[PDB]
Amino acid sequence: KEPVRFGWVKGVMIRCMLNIWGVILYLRLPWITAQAGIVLTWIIILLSVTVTSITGLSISAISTNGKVKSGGTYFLISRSLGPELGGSIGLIFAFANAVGVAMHTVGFAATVRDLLQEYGAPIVDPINDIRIIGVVSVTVLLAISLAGMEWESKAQVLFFLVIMVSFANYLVGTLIPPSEDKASKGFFSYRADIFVQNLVPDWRGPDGTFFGMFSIFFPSATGILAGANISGDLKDPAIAIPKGTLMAIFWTTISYLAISATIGSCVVRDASGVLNDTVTPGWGACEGLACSYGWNFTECTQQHSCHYGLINYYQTMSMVSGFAPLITAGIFGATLSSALACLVSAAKVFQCLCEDQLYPLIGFFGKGYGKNKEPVRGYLLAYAIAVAFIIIAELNTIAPIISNFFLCSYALINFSCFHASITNSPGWRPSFQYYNKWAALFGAIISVVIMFLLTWWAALIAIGVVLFLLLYVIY
Amino acid sequence: KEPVRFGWVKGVMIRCMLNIWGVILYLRLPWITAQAGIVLTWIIILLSVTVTSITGLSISAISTNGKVKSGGTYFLISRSLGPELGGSIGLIFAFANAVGVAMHTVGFAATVRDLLQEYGAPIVDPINDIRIIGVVSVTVLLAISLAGMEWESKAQVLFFLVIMVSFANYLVGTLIPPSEDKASKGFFSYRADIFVQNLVPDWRGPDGTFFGMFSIFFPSATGILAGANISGDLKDPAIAIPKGTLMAIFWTTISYLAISATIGSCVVRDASGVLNDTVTPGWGACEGLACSYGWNFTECTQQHSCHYGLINYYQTMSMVSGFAPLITAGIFGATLSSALACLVSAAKVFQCLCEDQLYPLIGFFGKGYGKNKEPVRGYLLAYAIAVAFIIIAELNTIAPIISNFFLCSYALINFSCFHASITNSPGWRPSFQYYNKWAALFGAIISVVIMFLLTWWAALIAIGVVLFLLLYVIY
Ligand SMILES: CN1[C@@H](CSCC(F)(F)F)Nc2cc(Cl)c(S(N)(=O)=O)cc2S1(=O)=O
Ligand SMILES: CN1[C@@H](CSCC(F)(F)F)Nc2cc(Cl)c(S(N)(=O)=O)cc2S1(=O)=O
Ligand code: NA
Ligand code: NA
């Protein structure tokens, strides 16, 4: 029986777009669009998708150089800078993936717990919900993954249709004239005054600065390596990976631009929330843009003490939409698909590191054969780390370290491309047309600069871990 | 004719103590002792002189391994981690020395300009005073250095006696009962109440925190390599360098502890300055410690608006002293001696890098023979950089970069000692008794941690410069 192989749409493009898409799309992008305005948010997005376009070009060059197995992303790092950065970066990559599984299952569990506690169902413990639900969910994802690749592919296609149905729901909701409830919370239909009033920044709070918004958005634009991790299950990786990866980046960026632009021209940044604030005839004068529409939000602006509008309410996108539960369905499909992509990615890197003869550090892990064409001893190792970090259940302080474990790989992939091309290395002869040494060098430099600019002590911890592994292997 | 050779007192100990001693001894240590109290200042000092004791032990181990020439400090880095970190760290070291010459000549020129502008107006303009005086002074130092080693040694001994005369002046001044003028500014003789009241911190201002005081004091404790840079002009380096370097560190630390402890038990932290604040009979009550001595400084504490006392006035040490001009003479001898040590150090590293066959980057600099047993083409290269940075004349923003250029050398010296000892390197067999691998490893780690903890972007710039040199040499 032949194995199962996938095309460039269902194998590379869908997976990459599903891993890039998360919950910043639903719960933070409308707030970033309010703090920083439309134009400066577009600058944020287009600056973030340059570091990932350059790395996508390096990946597309690596893919058109020969046949690699699934999870051999670090083979170029190994054969260009020695096999002790190969295995060390491989292990760091495959550990960051298995922690991202936990950090997404926790995000799904929190949404389910919040949805549950409103409907009734007296829960057990207000924080053991996020543990029981997380463990059950990660076990169901493990079963799906361990039942084969076809079932994982079908689950991913299901998630893709759910996300698109949420998008169409939102886009239909924005074209429907406001009702009393939505106009009382800020949503007015497409208006020209709101587009102009909302192009320029309005920073508020202790975190509202351009660096803060870059810190919120940038880590949620990466994920472009989900289709290159399974480069051994595709029908022709040398054509499937460049096209799929680059169109994934392109269409994800178009969605990010369209959502911010259309949300920024419909909802004002301050609104009261109660229907008893329509304009009174004879009430002297009122200050504010919405006064021309029949609503009076002066008390908010005077006191800074209300909870609705584009800048104060994190769930504006659910309010604008025609029917609200489809946005929650979109959130489910956005978190579970990223968790599934990370679980499949961390398994095929562990399974390659366990079979790597030149990096024998963890080659001892396998006892049973598991000869069913599945990385069983790489699925169980990722499941253990995911469950261990789901038990802890509060991961907002471990996040910078894990997020720098991923930029340590971007920097070394780009620098290995540059180093092998300038040195005329014996066997590195890519054929991708749009690849250049100096773009790769720029990507390698800018990834380290961003690593330290985000949080310097987390970068020091990441580099210390990589160095400890590298030096424990040399000695 | 034989060359001139020096003993361990006039060759290693005096030079190291004169390079460690600067102006923090005179103008900032009494202020650090006031912000942080006596005990926490002692902790500052003893934490700073651990990173330098460990590096002194590594240096003393390198020195008892064989005969090195003058300026071959980076030879162990070259033969343990390859000759492209050897030359790169050597060049960075010898450039930081030549910029330290400028940063000390500017400090001397500022003192001379301030002393001049008070006595009359024989000044061009502070702006260009600090340039004309700086250039003339650095040229006089260049002449002294270029006239031989004996004259430089005599100048250093002169500076040492001037500093000791300043110390004895201050110590005699603190034992003399206060007069009206000194008591009106805060100086009371050795009192027991003041010792107790002034042991615990009192942080004020936007910079008054333990990290801030570490940042002020730590860079002014290094300079321990001034006697190992001329290890080719000593009578027996293998005995002279360990003993001289370690006793230099010991006696400098004893002076740092004694000055802070004795200044902290004589002067209160707030005092008005005018003689019209003695205690009035019938003036109700007064708040403050000095009220028991006959002085009334309540208005300061109420308004925070006076300019004298240990915490507000930077020149307390000149006020306490019996005769004040000897403190200014001590400041001259402290800045000019450090500038002279840095000028001799940067010349003998440039001259070794110009004659280094395995690092040919700047081996082209020499045209004339200059066969007079002096590094003429290393003196002129250091003179050029010193003059170039004295013309700029405002160097408070370049300081962190230059100060991290010096911790990049500490880290690599310590790590090269550890790496050569664990690897059983063929030819690294030191005989210094008090040397251990793990102390060197700790020093190498803590130097990088301190590099980034002081200022992270300056550390990134320093590491980027080192990497650019290292990679330009490989390609
Ligand atoms: C959304 N993710 C961010 C990390 S932000 C959350 C944090 F982990 F930082 F806490 N970066 C990447 C990068 C890659 Cl390359 C891959 S993947 N599957 O290609 O290997 C997956 C991810 S992610 O899904 O974890
Ligand atoms: C007081 N100095 C501080 C630097 S603080 C001022 C700054 F440069 F940072 F701006 N560190 C060192 C270290 C060494 Cl090792 C040597 S030396 N002569 O042994 O090579 C000289 C010096 S220093 O005299 O420049
Ligand atoms: Na997703
Ligand atoms: Na000095």
UniProtKB/Swiss-Prot annotation, chains A, B:
Chloride binds at G223, I224, L225, Y410. This is Solute carrier family 12 member 3. Changing T262I: In GTLMNS; complete loss Na(+) uptake activity; partial loss of localization at the plasma membrane. Changing I62T: In GTLMNS; associated with deletion of N-436. Homodimer; adopts a domain-swap conformation at the scissor helices connecting the transmembrane domain and C-terminal domain. Interacts with KLHL3. Interacts with IL18R1; this interaction is increased by IL18 treatment. The chain crosses the membrane at residues 8-37, 38-59, 91-113, 126-150, 151-173, 209-230, 242-263, 324-347, 378-392, 398-414, 438-457, 458-469. The gene is SLC12A3. Changing Y410A: Abolished sodium and chloride ion cotransporter activity. The chain holds residues 132 to 605 of 1021 of the full protein. Residues 114-125, 174-208, 264-323, 393-397 are extracellular. Changing Y359H: In GTLMNS; 48% residual Na(+) uptake activity; no effect on localization at the plasma membrane.
